[PDB]
Amino acid sequence: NYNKAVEEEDKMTPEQLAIKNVGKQDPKRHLEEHVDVLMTSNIVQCLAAMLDTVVFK
Amino acid sequence: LFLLSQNRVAEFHTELERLPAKDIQTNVYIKHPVSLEQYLMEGSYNKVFLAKGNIPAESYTFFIDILLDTIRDEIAGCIEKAYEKILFTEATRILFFNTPKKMTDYAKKRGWVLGPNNYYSFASQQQKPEDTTIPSTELAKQVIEYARQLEMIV
Amino acid sequence: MSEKKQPVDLGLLEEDDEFEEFPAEDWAGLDEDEDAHVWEDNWDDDNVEDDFSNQLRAELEKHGYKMETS
Amino acid sequence: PPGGGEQEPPPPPAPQDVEMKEEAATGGGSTGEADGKTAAAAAEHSQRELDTVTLEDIKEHVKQLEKAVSGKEPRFVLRALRMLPSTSRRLNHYVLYKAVQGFFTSNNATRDFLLPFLEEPMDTEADLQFRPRTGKAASTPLLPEVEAYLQLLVVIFMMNSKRYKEAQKISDDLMQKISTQNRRALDLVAAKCYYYHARVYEFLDKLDVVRSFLHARLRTATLRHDADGQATLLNLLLRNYLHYSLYDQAEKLVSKSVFPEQANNNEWARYLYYTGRIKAIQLEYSEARRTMTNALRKAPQHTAVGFKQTVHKLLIVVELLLGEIPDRLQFRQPSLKRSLMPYFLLTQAVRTGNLAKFNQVLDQFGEKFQADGTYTLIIRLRHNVIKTGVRMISLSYSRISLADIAQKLQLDSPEDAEFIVAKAIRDGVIEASINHEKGYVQSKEMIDIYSTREPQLAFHQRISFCLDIHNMSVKAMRFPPKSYNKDL
Amino acid sequence: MILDKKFHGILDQGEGVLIIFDEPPVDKTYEAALETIQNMSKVVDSLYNKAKKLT
Amino acid sequence: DLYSRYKKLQQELEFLEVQEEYIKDEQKNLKKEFLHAQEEVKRIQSIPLVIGQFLEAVDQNTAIVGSTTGSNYYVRILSTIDRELLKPNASVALHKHSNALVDVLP
Amino acid sequence: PKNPDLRIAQLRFLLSLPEHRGDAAVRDELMAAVRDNNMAPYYEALCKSLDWQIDVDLLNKMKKANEDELKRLDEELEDAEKNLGESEIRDAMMAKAEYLCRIGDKEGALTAFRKTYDKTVALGHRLDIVFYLLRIGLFYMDNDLITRNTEKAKSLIEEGGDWDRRNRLKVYQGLYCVAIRDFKQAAELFLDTVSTFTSYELMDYKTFVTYTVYVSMIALERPDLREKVIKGAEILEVLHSLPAVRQYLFSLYECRYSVFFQSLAVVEQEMKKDWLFAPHYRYYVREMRIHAYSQLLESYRSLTLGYMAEAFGVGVEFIDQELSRFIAAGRLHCKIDKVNEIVETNRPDSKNWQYQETIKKGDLLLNRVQKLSRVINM
Amino acid sequence: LEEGKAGSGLRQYYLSKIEELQLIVNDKSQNLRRLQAQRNELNAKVRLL
């Protein structure tokens, strides 16, 4: 939901990228936060092998 | 004929380009191998047997018989595959004459069971699946590899 | 390199040398009605149109006659 | 006559300005760049070069210029010739020699002065130092302009150009190894030249020498190469093996290698087209299909209209062999349409599967696809119609009628029905259960997908492969930013 | 009423088998599809920007 | 010196090769120290605090904030906070000690 | 033009191909040939018309009448020219262009409407000129040309929707969306039918309803019907016009193919012999059939041949090959097996397939990031 | 002879290709140390904070 809430602005971004491109008036990084979201998303992958070990032996 | 007998027929397919040099093309012997192999692609042995008498007095008819002799294990091998089961009434038509060459050789070849004038097939989709333990382990190894590729240089 | 497109283009020029603007107009007869229309949907449309081009093109009016007979 | 005569001088020297500016910017830019460090900069101007070539390929330049506009041919680069130092007087001479022809008139010719182009390389190409790169950047751009219009007895002069090119460089080389950017460019340049006189080769005579020695010239390149030039030199050999080879026992599976990293946004497409054409002869349903379709979906850069039309023709041709033939949908161009117009009726007639009528119909209006020669894939297709048809039967219901469907398939007989059906079963491309009770043959014919049936083992390889592609895509969003941050 | 989709169920004629089933993860595939579609525009626009800055 | 260039260059090769594991160590450790310091400055911010009021922003990334008693306080905002909190009239909450604004409420 | 002669000249399609209706068609064509200067259109359509015996008689009068009227318009134009004014020259050039639309000359109308386009004081009058190009655009059945000026006048409006302006424009949108096969995006177009009134300029109200009833009944499913037309009183008011439409709606809503296939002939005959609706007569039939089949197979899994044959009132051999084609070419539901002599489906299109809906866009995204990798370094 | 100007030559050019690989190592170290200096700059920034 939050990622989509970012993406709706990301739809507005290529216009500005097609207009100015000089300087950054937006303090929001939009990157590292989503990276952290991926870090929280990696928990499933990391615990998958755990579940595999539990099931196996 | 050699390429067809040795199951090199793929190389025959890639050799199909040079033979139509339009040198003669009015001879049936020239269009004979490509039509015979085309019938082989059709898989029908009936057309070949019916056209067996169409071959002229030329002496390679015996070599054609040799071809049938070396493809008969392929034809019979494919028709006797029996994914489920078959009835003998079709076998009478497909298989050769009363000479017990097939019922002898294939009995010691395939090594199957014979019932009351019927061919029984086994080991068909009877394979038991895995315990899901091993693929889970290899998936765990894949997860480790994912950890490596995602973070190695870091 | 891209220089290998030259003999192909010359081949197209030969194809244009065969007939002069015949298939252009002949297919423009259909294309004028097919213009502005999505060419994605025209695949199945042309498929069915060419399939029924031989026989039973309509067949909708024949159903009423096939009610009592079938 | 007076009007055209008064309006005569302005049109011909139109390209002169932007062309001189082009060669000055490219030459002076590249040389002025790598002068300090040649070994540092690698293939920065390469894409610019190939872009300029692909741009100058469609040039309409010479049309009415056949008369006394050829005065630009005798003149040439002449940058800092005969002496390394004291380039000021020559900086004046750059304006001087251009001013000489700009007074009144100048003596010009066409076929008169040609051969003695090797006078300068006999002593000094330009500066006596940078001679190989300045020399190639001198000779190679202007050569196709002089060798333009292959017809009208330029063949002999083209041969002179050949032996001259060889003797000055190509025969062997000016030195053992250049080992620089001018060499990395020399690869694709010499390759482009090979493609240039390839037409002259295939025109009348055949190959007893050059491309046969091109193997020794290929391995003369060390195995430590990026194999870009090696692959480009492999493309012309494969194209020379394209028309007639017929022996798959060696180069197939021998020519396979480590396959280093190469993009170029061209070579992928054209080489995949080549090996796709080679692998289309054995009718590969799995690999060749998707890889040639992908190859068709690639190379957006220049023209997909006049190039991809052939690989599209081959695509649909090998597509209709499976019984399911997709047509042109997303791509709209007035080329592939006209190209597929004669083939459209029959490729649409494939799904119908009527032997008797279409047997005559094909040969009736058949022109191009039967001009492909030796009637191969079509004599395969003729009897492939019944296989795609019985495949459509496999996609159809189970119960087979002795009358109805036998008449629909235009084949009526108890034996050959079940026989051909069994031949469709042994292929392994479908699923059927052979059963005999009352004499009728049924089938389970389940086309149901892997949903809710052994899911893990089903999409396992899909997950692994797709994750691998996405991960190398992560590498693709990793390395280039580093290539951005390398200089800063 | 099944065509009106007021409840979960399906009818039968010959066999007369009544099957009732539901699909709880509705909000998953929807938001996922929305994310894919929205990101497609981003990638396409990016391709437009690159095609503009290059050729 | 021609053949010596090789053997002389090998030292530079090894010297440039030894920096790999070094930059590996740096890039792997300094990010851990980065998240360390990040959580160190994150734990500084606490929920219990005193709520003041915003007044005006005289410059970039710096402004003044009025208190409950009516006394205006001068406090530089943190770089993380965007320009959305620079609104002339809003309810702002500083820390009871650090006097920093984590977030604003409507 | 806004005259009925536009429709009279629009009847040339049914005047041409069929020889059955070619009597009354040429009858009221010749009858309306003396109105609104119809000389040139039926002179061009003369190939589809009778001989030159009675043809050349009226030509002598119409050609001099045209010249007189045209030179009178030129006289009025000269009277308006070299004088102080704005709307005078505008209305003069507009009326002149209208007469140029009456004679059927596209060039003169083009340059005239272009001149008055350059003379436009406002965007509203400009939009009026655009519409004036659209009404003749319906006759010339051009595609990009009629969408060009509308796309150009689409931006920078700011005056908001008017009463008959935005309405007529919405009708035009409905028409060009009738031409194109776009449906779902065009489903918002006919919602303005409440404010629509009788229009003699392009199409009558009942004709508009008769045209939109196809897309409304076919392209829109039952929830869409209940949300729009069933909840709305519009169809409730206009069902009293003809008994046919009401039966067509009720039979489909009640899923009765007995009377539907019986009245299907009338629907087929009404579908064809239409100006802009001609090329799509193949699409609507198949679409309605596959929609009905999908609707019937939606709530039904295992279907016996008897109840089906009694429901559709048609032979089993026809629906055999029908469904057989709708398997591969149709691509609606899963594989059907005849082993039990009873139709039985599975359709696992819900659970795993909902997650498998993103595999196509996922593969396309894979090719697209392969493209993204292709842009790299060159 | 045909060695020192041939074999040793292609050996030195092989060494030049080695210089190309070490150039890859070079600019990889460059952008890695630039990213390093960036992260160190941000860390020094929050250190100033």
PDB file of C-alpha atoms in Angstrom, chain D residues 46-47 50 264-266 268-269 294 297-301 324 392 394-399 442-445 447-452 462 466 469-470 473 476 480, chain G residues 319-325 327-329 334-341 346 348 351-353 356 359 362-363 365-367 369-371 373-378:
ATOM      1  CA  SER D  46      33.065   2.797 -31.351  1.00  0.00           C
ATOM      2  CA  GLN D  47      29.299   3.214 -31.002  1.00  0.00           C
ATOM      3  CA  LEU D  50      28.932   2.340 -36.122  1.00  0.00           C
ATOM      4  CA  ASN D 264      26.399  -4.370 -29.575  1.00  0.00           C
ATOM      5  CA  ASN D 265      22.570  -4.413 -29.852  1.00  0.00           C
ATOM      6  CA  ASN D 266      23.032  -5.930 -33.321  1.00  0.00           C
ATOM      7  CA  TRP D 268      22.849 -10.741 -30.854  1.00  0.00           C
ATOM      8  CA  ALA D 269      19.931 -10.309 -33.245  1.00  0.00           C
ATOM      9  CA  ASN D 294      12.768 -13.297 -28.622  1.00  0.00           C
ATOM     10  CA  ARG D 297      11.355  -8.995 -30.200  1.00  0.00           C
ATOM     11  CA  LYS D 298      14.911  -7.644 -29.961  1.00  0.00           C
ATOM     12  CA  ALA D 299      16.947  -5.094 -31.948  1.00  0.00           C
ATOM     13  CA  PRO D 300      14.517  -2.122 -31.829  1.00  0.00           C
ATOM     14  CA  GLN D 301      17.355   0.317 -32.561  1.00  0.00           C
ATOM     15  CA  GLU D 324      -0.994 -23.398 -33.899  1.00  0.00           C
ATOM     16  CA  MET D 392      -6.045 -30.950 -33.632  1.00  0.00           C
ATOM     17  CA  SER D 394      -5.765 -34.739 -29.956  1.00  0.00           C
ATOM     18  CA  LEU D 395      -6.976 -31.298 -28.886  1.00  0.00           C
ATOM     19  CA  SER D 396     -10.456 -32.447 -29.911  1.00  0.00           C
ATOM     20  CA  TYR D 397     -12.736 -34.936 -28.158  1.00  0.00           C
ATOM     21  CA  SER D 398     -11.948 -38.556 -27.291  1.00  0.00           C
ATOM     22  CA  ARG D 399     -14.483 -40.793 -29.049  1.00  0.00           C
ATOM     23  CA  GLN D 442     -10.900 -43.921 -26.093  1.00  0.00           C
ATOM     24  CA  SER D 443      -8.523 -41.427 -24.478  1.00  0.00           C
ATOM     25  CA  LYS D 444      -8.204 -39.509 -21.211  1.00  0.00           C
ATOM     26  CA  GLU D 445      -6.787 -36.591 -23.244  1.00  0.00           C
ATOM     27  CA  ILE D 447      -4.711 -31.050 -21.135  1.00  0.00           C
ATOM     28  CA  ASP D 448      -5.077 -29.758 -17.564  1.00  0.00           C
ATOM     29  CA  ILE D 449      -2.095 -27.765 -16.300  1.00  0.00           C
ATOM     30  CA  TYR D 450       0.116 -28.299 -13.252  1.00  0.00           C
ATOM     31  CA  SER D 451      -2.230 -26.337 -10.979  1.00  0.00           C
ATOM     32  CA  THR D 452      -2.819 -28.189  -7.692  1.00  0.00           C
ATOM     33  CA  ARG D 462      10.634 -21.624 -13.358  1.00  0.00           C
ATOM     34  CA  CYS D 466      13.389 -16.406 -13.344  1.00  0.00           C
ATOM     35  CA  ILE D 469      17.404 -13.677 -14.685  1.00  0.00           C
ATOM     36  CA  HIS D 470      16.202 -11.117 -12.142  1.00  0.00           C
ATOM     37  CA  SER D 473      19.305  -8.038 -13.840  1.00  0.00           C
ATOM     38  CA  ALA D 476      22.763  -5.194 -14.584  1.00  0.00           C
ATOM     39  CA  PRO D 480      26.772   0.130 -14.918  1.00  0.00           C
TER      40      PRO D 480
ATOM     41  CA  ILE G 319     -22.704 -27.615 -30.913  1.00  0.00           C
ATOM     42  CA  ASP G 320     -20.178 -30.445 -31.117  1.00  0.00           C
ATOM     43  CA  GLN G 321     -18.000 -28.676 -33.686  1.00  0.00           C
ATOM     44  CA  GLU G 322     -19.021 -25.341 -32.147  1.00  0.00           C
ATOM     45  CA  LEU G 323     -17.585 -26.095 -28.704  1.00  0.00           C
ATOM     46  CA  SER G 324     -14.739 -27.990 -30.387  1.00  0.00           C
ATOM     47  CA  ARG G 325     -13.749 -24.748 -32.111  1.00  0.00           C
ATOM     48  CA  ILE G 327     -11.799 -24.875 -27.184  1.00  0.00           C
ATOM     49  CA  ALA G 328      -8.779 -23.973 -29.315  1.00  0.00           C
ATOM     50  CA  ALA G 329      -9.871 -20.873 -31.239  1.00  0.00           C
ATOM     51  CA  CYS G 334     -10.720 -26.124 -19.871  1.00  0.00           C
ATOM     52  CA  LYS G 335     -10.723 -29.349 -21.893  1.00  0.00           C
ATOM     53  CA  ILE G 336     -14.041 -31.129 -22.453  1.00  0.00           C
ATOM     54  CA  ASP G 337     -14.216 -34.935 -22.599  1.00  0.00           C
ATOM     55  CA  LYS G 338     -16.955 -36.871 -24.409  1.00  0.00           C
ATOM     56  CA  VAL G 339     -16.061 -40.260 -22.880  1.00  0.00           C
ATOM     57  CA  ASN G 340     -19.119 -40.165 -20.604  1.00  0.00           C
ATOM     58  CA  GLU G 341     -21.316 -38.726 -23.376  1.00  0.00           C
ATOM     59  CA  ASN G 346     -13.021 -28.498 -14.489  1.00  0.00           C
ATOM     60  CA  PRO G 348      -9.127 -24.291 -12.393  1.00  0.00           C
ATOM     61  CA  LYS G 351      -6.913 -20.168  -7.382  1.00  0.00           C
ATOM     62  CA  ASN G 352      -3.559 -20.834  -9.043  1.00  0.00           C
ATOM     63  CA  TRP G 353      -4.597 -18.977 -12.186  1.00  0.00           C
ATOM     64  CA  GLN G 356      -0.728 -16.968 -12.856  1.00  0.00           C
ATOM     65  CA  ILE G 359       3.184 -14.469 -15.453  1.00  0.00           C
ATOM     66  CA  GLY G 362       6.123 -10.977 -15.811  1.00  0.00           C
ATOM     67  CA  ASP G 363       7.579 -12.539 -18.947  1.00  0.00           C
ATOM     68  CA  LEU G 365       8.747  -7.482 -17.987  1.00  0.00           C
ATOM     69  CA  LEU G 366      11.558 -10.026 -18.291  1.00  0.00           C
ATOM     70  CA  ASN G 367      11.923  -9.223 -21.983  1.00  0.00           C
ATOM     71  CA  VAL G 369      14.496  -5.710 -18.552  1.00  0.00           C
ATOM     72  CA  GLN G 370      16.380  -7.679 -21.189  1.00  0.00           C
ATOM     73  CA  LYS G 371      15.765  -4.567 -23.276  1.00  0.00           C
ATOM     74  CA  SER G 373      20.050  -4.660 -20.267  1.00  0.00           C
ATOM     75  CA  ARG G 374      20.284  -4.114 -24.024  1.00  0.00           C
ATOM     76  CA  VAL G 375      20.459  -0.328 -23.596  1.00  0.00           C
ATOM     77  CA  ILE G 376      23.494  -0.851 -21.340  1.00  0.00           C
ATOM     78  CA  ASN G 377      26.814   0.521 -22.660  1.00  0.00           C
ATOM     79  CA  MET G 378      25.288   1.210 -26.092  1.00  0.00           C
TER      80      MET G 378
END
